[PDB]
Amino acid sequence: QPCYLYVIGMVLTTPLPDELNFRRRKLYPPEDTTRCFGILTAKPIPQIPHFPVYTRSGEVTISIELAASGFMLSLQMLELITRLHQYIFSHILRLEYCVLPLNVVNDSTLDIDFKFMEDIEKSEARIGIPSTKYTKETPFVFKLEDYQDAVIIPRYRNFDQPHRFYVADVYTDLTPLSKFPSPEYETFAEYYKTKYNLDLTNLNQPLLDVDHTSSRLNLLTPRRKAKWESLQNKQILVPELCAIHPIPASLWRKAVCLPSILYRLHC
RNA sequence: AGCGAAUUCGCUU
RNA sequence: AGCGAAUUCGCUU
């Protein structure tokens, strides 16, 4: 049975106006990164008019366009794709035919990003992963490029249901020795040692300002829980204590649009 | 919001 | 005890 491949085109057609950017966020147009999402089906999708999803960066115009048709894929590849589909929905969005990542081939043309899919699996299988065994002899090294397009997860808590953040900002003028915002501790270093028995090997590293990855399911329409949402983004994280998720933030922002997009496609 | 914990209250004739 | 409902409190830096 032959396959159809669609590109979910995303373009930030109306960026958020400054007078609505209350949380003072940087705006990330999807068209600035080549990697994106696509749909693999066994039957065609009828022509569907361009429509808006309303995201944190503003209004993004969605278009479904055919990339490829009449090809076959091996059992193995179909299996892999099926796994990543499920991964995207269960593990990234946490929800309850195939969505898959596209990218440009070395030459403008979008195709199935197999290498990325294999990288995710490798990461998940704990294959090809750098050390997190930091000591005085082999200390944590902060690399600014690894915290550009990053989603991060504090390792040291919530083993069951890890919370996820975009790096909102890198505070180059803070370090683990900076003063802690709560009186009961003098520094970040003291906090994590006291609260979690975590040692730090790099005391000059920047700290991170975060912004929680959303959960807002329906983006087809525009715009206790008050105390939390407040405090939530006031958190400041230490790089050495946080994992970088194998999914880049650029793609994560596109992924949270999927449920609205698939909802619209089912009509 | 979520996960915990306590307190008060409502239902059976 | 079970099922509801409200009130107070605790956790993330």
PDB file of all heavy atoms in Angstrom, chain A residues 49-61:
ATOM      1  N   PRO A  49      -8.230  24.749   3.519  1.00  0.00           N
ATOM      2  CA  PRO A  49      -7.831  26.154   3.433  1.00  0.00           C
ATOM      3  C   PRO A  49      -6.903  26.527   4.570  1.00  0.00           C
ATOM      4  O   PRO A  49      -6.981  25.928   5.634  1.00  0.00           O
ATOM      5  CB  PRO A  49      -9.162  26.907   3.526  1.00  0.00           C
ATOM      6  CG  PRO A  49     -10.104  25.945   4.168  1.00  0.00           C
ATOM      7  CD  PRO A  49      -9.676  24.581   3.752  1.00  0.00           C
ATOM      8  N   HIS A  50      -6.019  27.484   4.316  1.00  0.00           N
ATOM      9  CA  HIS A  50      -5.101  28.001   5.316  1.00  0.00           C
ATOM     10  C   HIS A  50      -5.863  28.471   6.534  1.00  0.00           C
ATOM     11  O   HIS A  50      -6.878  29.147   6.393  1.00  0.00           O
ATOM     12  CB  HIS A  50      -4.335  29.188   4.739  1.00  0.00           C
ATOM     13  CG  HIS A  50      -3.281  28.801   3.755  1.00  0.00           C
ATOM     14  ND1 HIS A  50      -2.224  29.624   3.438  1.00  0.00           N
ATOM     15  CD2 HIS A  50      -3.117  27.675   3.020  1.00  0.00           C
ATOM     16  CE1 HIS A  50      -1.452  29.021   2.549  1.00  0.00           C
ATOM     17  NE2 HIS A  50      -1.975  27.838   2.277  1.00  0.00           N
ATOM     18  N   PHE A  51      -5.374  28.131   7.724  1.00  0.00           N
ATOM     19  CA  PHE A  51      -6.042  28.544   8.961  1.00  0.00           C
ATOM     20  C   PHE A  51      -5.054  28.933  10.074  1.00  0.00           C
ATOM     21  O   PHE A  51      -3.906  28.478  10.079  1.00  0.00           O
ATOM     22  CB  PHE A  51      -6.997  27.449   9.444  1.00  0.00           C
ATOM     23  CG  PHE A  51      -6.309  26.179   9.840  1.00  0.00           C
ATOM     24  CD1 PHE A  51      -5.903  25.969  11.158  1.00  0.00           C
ATOM     25  CD2 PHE A  51      -6.070  25.185   8.903  1.00  0.00           C
ATOM     26  CE1 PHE A  51      -5.252  24.785  11.532  1.00  0.00           C
ATOM     27  CE2 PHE A  51      -5.435  24.000   9.268  1.00  0.00           C
ATOM     28  CZ  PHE A  51      -5.020  23.801  10.585  1.00  0.00           C
ATOM     29  N   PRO A  52      -5.496  29.794  11.009  1.00  0.00           N
ATOM     30  CA  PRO A  52      -4.651  30.257  12.120  1.00  0.00           C
ATOM     31  C   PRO A  52      -4.643  29.350  13.353  1.00  0.00           C
ATOM     32  O   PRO A  52      -5.695  28.860  13.757  1.00  0.00           O
ATOM     33  CB  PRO A  52      -5.295  31.592  12.497  1.00  0.00           C
ATOM     34  CG  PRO A  52      -6.715  31.401  12.169  1.00  0.00           C
ATOM     35  CD  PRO A  52      -6.738  30.577  10.918  1.00  0.00           C
ATOM     36  N   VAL A  53      -3.460  29.119  13.919  1.00  0.00           N
ATOM     37  CA  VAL A  53      -3.364  28.757  15.328  1.00  0.00           C
ATOM     38  C   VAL A  53      -2.748  29.941  16.086  1.00  0.00           C
ATOM     39  O   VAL A  53      -1.905  30.664  15.555  1.00  0.00           O
ATOM     40  CB  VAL A  53      -2.550  27.480  15.570  1.00  0.00           C
ATOM     41  CG1 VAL A  53      -3.277  26.275  14.997  1.00  0.00           C
ATOM     42  CG2 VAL A  53      -1.168  27.605  14.984  1.00  0.00           C
ATOM     43  N   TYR A  54      -3.205  30.159  17.314  1.00  0.00           N
ATOM     44  CA  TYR A  54      -2.777  31.305  18.114  1.00  0.00           C
ATOM     45  C   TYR A  54      -1.831  30.855  19.203  1.00  0.00           C
ATOM     46  O   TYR A  54      -2.209  30.164  20.135  1.00  0.00           O
ATOM     47  CB  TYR A  54      -3.987  32.027  18.701  1.00  0.00           C
ATOM     48  CG  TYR A  54      -4.896  32.555  17.621  1.00  0.00           C
ATOM     49  CD1 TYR A  54      -5.987  31.817  17.182  1.00  0.00           C
ATOM     50  CD2 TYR A  54      -4.640  33.771  17.007  1.00  0.00           C
ATOM     51  CE1 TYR A  54      -6.811  32.291  16.178  1.00  0.00           C
ATOM     52  CE2 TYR A  54      -5.461  34.253  16.003  1.00  0.00           C
ATOM     53  CZ  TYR A  54      -6.542  33.510  15.592  1.00  0.00           C
ATOM     54  OH  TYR A  54      -7.357  33.990  14.589  1.00  0.00           O
ATOM     55  N   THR A  55      -0.577  31.234  19.054  1.00  0.00           N
ATOM     56  CA  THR A  55       0.474  30.721  19.898  1.00  0.00           C
ATOM     57  C   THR A  55       1.083  31.869  20.666  1.00  0.00           C
ATOM     58  O   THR A  55       0.759  33.023  20.436  1.00  0.00           O
ATOM     59  CB  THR A  55       1.595  30.121  19.057  1.00  0.00           C
ATOM     60  OG1 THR A  55       2.365  31.183  18.475  1.00  0.00           O
ATOM     61  CG2 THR A  55       1.023  29.242  17.948  1.00  0.00           C
ATOM     62  N   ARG A  56       2.007  31.533  21.549  1.00  0.00           N
ATOM     63  CA  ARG A  56       2.694  32.513  22.351  1.00  0.00           C
ATOM     64  C   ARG A  56       3.433  33.553  21.545  1.00  0.00           C
ATOM     65  O   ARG A  56       3.584  34.682  22.008  1.00  0.00           O
ATOM     66  CB  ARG A  56       3.676  31.836  23.276  1.00  0.00           C
ATOM     67  CG  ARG A  56       3.038  31.057  24.382  1.00  0.00           C
ATOM     68  CD  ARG A  56       4.143  30.450  25.194  1.00  0.00           C
ATOM     69  NE  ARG A  56       3.663  29.619  26.276  1.00  0.00           N
ATOM     70  CZ  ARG A  56       4.479  29.007  27.118  1.00  0.00           C
ATOM     71  NH1 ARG A  56       5.790  29.147  26.975  1.00  0.00           N
ATOM     72  NH2 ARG A  56       3.986  28.271  28.100  1.00  0.00           N
ATOM     73  N   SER A  57       3.915  33.196  20.358  1.00  0.00           N
ATOM     74  CA  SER A  57       4.645  34.182  19.557  1.00  0.00           C
ATOM     75  C   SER A  57       3.734  35.051  18.690  1.00  0.00           C
ATOM     76  O   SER A  57       4.199  36.011  18.085  1.00  0.00           O
ATOM     77  CB  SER A  57       5.741  33.534  18.723  1.00  0.00           C
ATOM     78  OG  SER A  57       6.740  32.953  19.539  1.00  0.00           O
ATOM     79  N   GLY A  58       2.437  34.735  18.660  1.00  0.00           N
ATOM     80  CA  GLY A  58       1.490  35.443  17.814  1.00  0.00           C
ATOM     81  C   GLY A  58       0.677  34.491  16.943  1.00  0.00           C
ATOM     82  O   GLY A  58       0.601  33.289  17.218  1.00  0.00           O
ATOM     83  N   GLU A  59       0.056  35.022  15.893  1.00  0.00           N
ATOM     84  CA  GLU A  59      -0.748  34.197  15.000  1.00  0.00           C
ATOM     85  C   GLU A  59       0.084  33.517  13.903  1.00  0.00           C
ATOM     86  O   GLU A  59       0.747  34.173  13.096  1.00  0.00           O
ATOM     87  CB  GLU A  59      -1.881  34.999  14.367  1.00  0.00           C
ATOM     88  CG  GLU A  59      -2.538  34.248  13.219  1.00  0.00           C
ATOM     89  CD  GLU A  59      -3.483  35.106  12.408  1.00  0.00           C
ATOM     90  OE1 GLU A  59      -2.996  35.920  11.593  1.00  0.00           O
ATOM     91  OE2 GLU A  59      -4.711  34.958  12.577  1.00  0.00           O
ATOM     92  N   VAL A  60       0.026  32.190  13.887  1.00  0.00           N
ATOM     93  CA  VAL A  60       0.757  31.372  12.931  1.00  0.00           C
ATOM     94  C   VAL A  60      -0.211  30.801  11.912  1.00  0.00           C
ATOM     95  O   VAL A  60      -1.209  30.170  12.275  1.00  0.00           O
ATOM     96  CB  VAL A  60       1.464  30.226  13.653  1.00  0.00           C
ATOM     97  CG1 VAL A  60       1.778  29.098  12.703  1.00  0.00           C
ATOM     98  CG2 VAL A  60       2.715  30.732  14.304  1.00  0.00           C
ATOM     99  N   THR A  61       0.053  31.050  10.636  1.00  0.00           N
ATOM    100  CA  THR A  61      -0.807  30.508   9.593  1.00  0.00           C
ATOM    101  C   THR A  61      -0.381  29.081   9.250  1.00  0.00           C
ATOM    102  O   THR A  61       0.796  28.811   9.011  1.00  0.00           O
ATOM    103  CB  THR A  61      -0.828  31.388   8.347  1.00  0.00           C
ATOM    104  OG1 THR A  61      -1.422  32.648   8.677  1.00  0.00           O
ATOM    105  CG2 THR A  61      -1.655  30.731   7.253  1.00  0.00           C
TER     106      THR A  61
END
